[PDB]
Structure 1
Amino acid sequence: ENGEKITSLHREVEKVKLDQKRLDQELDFILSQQKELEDLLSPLEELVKEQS
């Protein structure tokens, strides 16, 4: 009875650890794609500033 709970528990520690590590890598991919977007945007901000 105690062993089944502690083994099912050990399996659900390792699940959340894997899912937390996945979110870190998905955040790192967003932060890089935000830099591609911010670096596509600046060339348009400059063109308007010359036209005003």
Structure 2
Amino acid sequence: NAWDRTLIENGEKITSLHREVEKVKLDQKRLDQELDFILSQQKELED
């Protein structure tokens, strides 16, 4: 029925969404380190 269907997929999407979120936080941290090093990169070229 429509109720248990919604209640089951909501459960599956919550789990799924949490996992997309963690993968993104990871790439956020990697991208963030690239910025640090690109920053530093231009600054040493100024020499």
TM over 0.5: yes
> Rg: which structure is higher?
1
Deviation for aligned residue 1:20? 1.0
Is there any run of 5+ residues in structure 2 with no aligned partner, and where?
1-8
**Once superposed, which parts of structure 1, at least 4 consecutive aligned residues long, lie more than 3 Å away?**
none
Q: In 1, Cα distance between the equivalents of 2:10 and 2:28?
A: 27
Taking the aligned partners of 2:44 and 2:24, their CA distance within structure 1 comes to: 31
The DSSP-based 3-state class of the residue aligned with 1:33 is helix
Q: How many residues align?
A: 39
TM-score normalised by structure 1 residue count = 0.66
Q: Report sequence identity in percent.
A: 100
Q: How much is the aligned-residue C-alpha RMSD, in angstroms? A: 0.9
State TM-score, norm by structure 2: 0.72
Q: 1:19 aligns with which of 27, 35, 38?
A: 27
